[PDB]
Amino acid sequence: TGVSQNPRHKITKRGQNVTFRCDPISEHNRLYWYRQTLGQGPEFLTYFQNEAQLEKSRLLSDRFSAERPKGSFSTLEIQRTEQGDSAMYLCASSSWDTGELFFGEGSRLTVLEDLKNVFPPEVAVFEPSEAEISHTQKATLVCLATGFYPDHVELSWWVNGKEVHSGVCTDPQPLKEQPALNDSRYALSSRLRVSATFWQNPRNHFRCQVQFYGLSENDEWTQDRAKPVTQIVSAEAWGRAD
């Protein structure tokens, strides 16, 4: 039903090779590769009509290659990655009969100088103020994720084992813990608001979950700290009767 891409993220050190896979909407004869950097618009990479690669950005490096062997799925390979390769890699497909492009969720590539700057988040949940409860009859929890690099995180709220969206908002962008430096670690916050009566039930369980897209297991690691692999870091609170 939708365009699928594997993987969602990939961190890489300079010089390494990377391969992304795209699966179009069933039977779509036209497939496109694009990439996009933050704050800008998508830039064209390549076009396939069935198996044949009909158009390719003239400026794009020969290090970039794409193939679509049987039509259908396509891979995009980047050899000897450079920092400048860092972007969201978008795949799109279209049917022969209509011009509408359907996009995948993207593959986020971050190519870094050295992997020693990669850090997972620390996560903490801060409980509602008694003053907020008295004043508004509502209760806001705050989740803070701090000290992560690069900024590849998804934060979610879980109430009694169920993901919630209502009463939630998460900062649009992380802030830098040192806005000047290029390799500053990041911090991100989110709020979950519930009624005071819901907070005041001690059986109610609140969890903030932060998914971090980090290193693989094929990445070399020789630091004493834990390898900053892709992981979930969470924190939690329970309701308080008053």
Partner: protein, 204 residues
């Protein structure tokens, strides 16, 4: 040769207002134009597609015009909702080329209409055993902006809208924190222009 321009680069509007997004292109030899919406860090969703010979297309609260000879397209969004907040991108496909050439996008934010503002700054303590806390500025109307701190050891987030959907209740908030000794929620947002009646609660 083709250059696609979008203005404004960024747009903030009160919920309920109609809005106008502009796209320009220097080469009129286009085959079609397509508008997309992007939730940042994800993919694009097609909104409208207008053929070079067509003058208009509509879908729900969305309507777009095309003047191919003028090298212009306009996207109209009626009765804006905070859920419309996204990046809106314009792209053209050229005669005898298969690729789409994209503009840089308009970053749209639709600010909630706060029915009963109750601006306040609360202190929240860590659920885990520690000395840590944060300051929450909340319940201010959408005209209020949250500024960065004079002090670089103080972290302050941008404002954020949450929707308590079943309650038909929206509220704005921002969070501040710091490791420094003299940090207090009473002074955390001192550099922002905040309502004069902002509530600062006593001992817990």
């Amino acid at each position: 040769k083709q250059e696609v321009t979008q203005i404004p680069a960024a747009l903030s509007v009160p919920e309920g207002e109609n809005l106008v997004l502009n796209c320009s292109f220097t080469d009129s030899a286009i085959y079609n134009l397509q508008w997309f919406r992007q939730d940042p860090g994800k993919g694009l969703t097609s909104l409208l597609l207008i053929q070079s010979s067509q003058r208009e297309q509509t879908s729900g609260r969305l309507n777009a015009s095309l003047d191919k000879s003028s090298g212009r397209s306009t996207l109209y969004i009626a009765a804006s909702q905070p859920g419309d907040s996204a990046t809106y991108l314009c792209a053209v496909r050229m005669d005898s080329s298969y690729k789409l050439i994209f503009g840089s996008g308009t970053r749209l934010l639709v600010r909630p209409d706060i029915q009963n503002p109750d601006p306040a700054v609360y202190q929240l303590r860590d659920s885990k055993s520690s000395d840590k806390s944060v300051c929450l500025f909340t319940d201010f109307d959408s005209q209020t902006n949250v500024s960065q701190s004079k002090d670089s050891d103080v972290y302050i987030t941008d404002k954020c809208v949450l929707d308590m959907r079943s309650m038909d209740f929206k509220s704005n908030s921002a969070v501040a924190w710091s490791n420094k000794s003299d940090f207090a929620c009473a002074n955390a947002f001192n550099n922002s222009i905040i309502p004069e009646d902002t509530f600062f609660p006593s001992p817990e």
